Design a protein that fits this description.
Elements: E1 5-9, H1 17-24, E2 30-36, E3 40-45, H2 48-57, E4 62-63, E5 66-67, E6 69-70
Antiparallel strand pairs: 1-3, 1-6, 2-3, 4-5
């Protein structure tokens, strides 16, 4: 649901679906990940607690040199 969903932006253009999913395993189990051009993505986790963990802990985390923005 919406509570399990997180918007990711700020990724390097070349960062892939695989790489992002791997990174967000530090928030919890990913059930959905969709990557758009320009370093954007939408991710869903198993639980709302995972999504909250992503936003609160992985905010401004670095991925392949780029600083992420999560909300």
């Amino acid at each position: 649901g919406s509570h399990m969903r997180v918007q990711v932006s700020g990724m390097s253009d070349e960062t892939t679906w695989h790489t992002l999913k791997d990174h967000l395993r530090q928030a919890g189990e990913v059930t959905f990940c969709k990557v758009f051009s320009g370093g954007r993505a939408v991710v869903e986790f198993v639980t709302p607690e995972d999504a909250a963990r992503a936003i609160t802990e992985l905010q401004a985390s670095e991925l392949e040199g780029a600083t992420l923005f999560l909300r």
